[PDB]
Amino acid sequence: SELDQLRQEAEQLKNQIRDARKACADATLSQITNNIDPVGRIQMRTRRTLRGHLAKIYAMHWGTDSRLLVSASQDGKLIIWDSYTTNKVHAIPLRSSWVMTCAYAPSGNYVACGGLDNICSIYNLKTREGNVRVSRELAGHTGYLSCCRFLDDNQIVTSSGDTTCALWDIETGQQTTTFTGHTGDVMSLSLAPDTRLFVSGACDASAKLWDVREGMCRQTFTGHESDINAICFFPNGNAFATGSDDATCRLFDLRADQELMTYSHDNIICGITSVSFSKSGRLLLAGYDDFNCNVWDALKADRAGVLAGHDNRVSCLGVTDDGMAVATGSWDSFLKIWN
Amino acid sequence: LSAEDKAAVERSKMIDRNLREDGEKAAREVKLLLLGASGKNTIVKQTGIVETHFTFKDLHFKMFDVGAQRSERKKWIHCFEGVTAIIFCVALSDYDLVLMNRMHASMKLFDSICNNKWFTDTSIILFLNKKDLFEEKIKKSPLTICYPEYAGSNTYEEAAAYIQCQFEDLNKRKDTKEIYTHFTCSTDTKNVQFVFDAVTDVIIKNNLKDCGLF
């Protein structure tokens, strides 16, 4: 009998939350931005093509300097490229070839990787010897790691396929805080510009907002009908965008706790693998399963352009800190730097 | 280019040479994906996923065991698009045991793996384990408990043939792939020999398809 009462209380709380969200929504973002000048057309060209991978590329991450980028692939390799000159700087062979995520430290000293091995391995790039050594192998997750992000040189936040995200202390190798609440596998992670509160998207068609210190869920966003694969904060930290298998991108605001706009096209029936914003945030670059990337005017839900040129699925794309370039990875073992 | 630019280019070229060498070395190495519901002893041992490397007659084998990954398969099964073959282990003694029937759950998993959109052309090696126990417990219990429409002799050979036929009859698109079935014995590494034969046949088919004379 108590279970029924608890379920009724939970349903009442959910109804109250829905009523509050409905009340807070008066004018749509499309209504407000109807009276702005649309972007005419975006025509980016492949400035560089980074070759050398012999397997599907599952992850990439730009550096803070916006010149060096890290890649991960099934060939058990993790390459740091010089994008300006197309020169390989390091070629780190991973102990596990099943890598699904890669990260670049903001300071540039370390890179991280993870995958089916249930380990986030930190690699020290700047050592007295000329090789990159494994700083340590972080363990504790039960499911595959989907996204690892550096907060600083000592703290790394990871998303796993055991429905829990974790915050680590690299010096001690211990989980400082474990985040719980997701029913499904967590497939995405994005840190706020202040590195203060981050958001994760899971396969329960929900996105949850966390705090690194307190380790509890501030907000829950539920708009999607399928599995969220990628997530990205707005540059101001007050909004984030999600990509899901139902061929729709959605914009959520943290303060209003609601979905503002949805990005969808009739000709698009494939899923979304990676989403990123421009430096200003008006362009939403989303990768897709149909071998190409799309540029969406984030304020008008209009397709500004298409980044075609990949012969297989686009798995990871990133936009540099200075906003000059966009680098898209694909399963055809080819990176391409756009403008 | 400057002096450091030239030296960086030379370093990148050395990295490219090493990458090409590693790719050539890893292209001839056979990748196997081991699944079950089941029986892994003597086949995988002789958190995370388990990597097993062994060599049989000038071929290097990698077998991946993903049984410890307790998550949704649809988000990590595409990592095994290029595996040479899928080794699937089904126990024959689970027809009368419940974890739905154990054998029926095994058949459902086999159907999902065989008809997955990533393995439309990936051969499956079906190892039917515990044949000694199945022969021991088949006289005292008929297969009608698992398959009510058996209508056949309750002997070891007929029962095994029926199980095998039910297993390859779940293989739609039965033109681009052959399912290899073997009842696991423990003499003279016959399981390894069967895996070798299946893998070399698959290698021949792949080479012929690549060369454009298929």
């Epitope: 010149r67 060096l68 010089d82 000159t85 020169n87 700087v89 390091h90 540039g108 007295r128 010897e129 000329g130 090789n131 | 400057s2 002096a3 450091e4 630019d5 030239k6 030296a7 960086a8 030379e10 370093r11 050395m14």
Partner: single-chain antibody, 232 residues
């Protein structure tokens, strides 16, 4: 990380000797290596250079055709074969580690150095000052000049600042301008542009006493400047 050399000794003029350097503590296969020689009372001079993989070699014009440089990666050793030794080849020979990628720190480590005694176009680096007197707790600026501008089209200026402590091998302080080498205290700074460079020490201590040398890596004669000696 350490480099030790061997050989040296008294060589009759016109003879030949093979200097060898042993590398320990680092991935010797991945670093290009240099030979920098110092006269018994003069500045540093660059002799030869062998790259990673033994795919790119250079010699100084004063030792070209008479010296041979080769490395043995499995043994972590390096050699410098000399033919037709002259009285001008007497010097203390140093082996220098140098790795070249983006953001690298070339000339980071220097060997102890072995002495060789023999019985009896190119960018010029100018360090006009010498025997500059210093007092502890005071700031000192050291100048350096180049015949050709060291600012490449990519924005990288190639000026290497070194520190020759009395009785010790040179230590890298600044590799590219305003790039402080690892392990160097954060009181050293580099500034300048084109053909003019300065090195500023915030508060010089007893360990900052020595001879400071320049380098250009723009081309492949590697030229130094007669160092400026700081004395208490």
């Amino acid at each position: 990380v350490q480099l030790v050399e061997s050989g040296g000794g008294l060589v009759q003029p016109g003879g030949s000797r093979k200097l060898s350097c042993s590398a320990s503590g680092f991935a010797f296969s991945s670093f290009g290596m240099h030979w920098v020689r110092q006269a018994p009372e003069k500045g540093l001079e660059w002799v030869a250079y062998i790259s990673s993989g033994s795919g790119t070699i250079y010699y100084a014009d004063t030792v070209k055709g008479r010296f041979t440089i080769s490395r043995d990666d499995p043994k972590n050793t390096l050699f410098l074969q000399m033919t037709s030794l002259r009285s001008e080849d007497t010097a203390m020979y140093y082996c220098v580690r140098s790795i070249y990628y983006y953001g690298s720190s070339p000339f980071d480590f220097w060997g102890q150095g072995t002495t060789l005694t023999v019985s009896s176009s190119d960018i010029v680096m100018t360090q006009a000052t010498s025997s500059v007197p210093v007092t502890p707790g005071e700031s000192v600026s050291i100048s350096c000049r180049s015949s050709k501008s060291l600012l490449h089209s990519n924005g990288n200026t190639y000026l290497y600042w070194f520190l020759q402590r009395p009785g010790q091998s040179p230590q890298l302080l600044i590799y590219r301008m305003s790039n402080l080498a690892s392990g160097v205290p954060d009181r050293f700074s580099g500034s300048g542009s084109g053909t003019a460079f300065t090195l500023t020490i915030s508060r010089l201590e007893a360990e900052d006493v020595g001879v400071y040398y320049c380098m250009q890596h723009l081309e492949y004669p590697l030229t130094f400047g007669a160092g400026t000696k700081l004395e208490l």
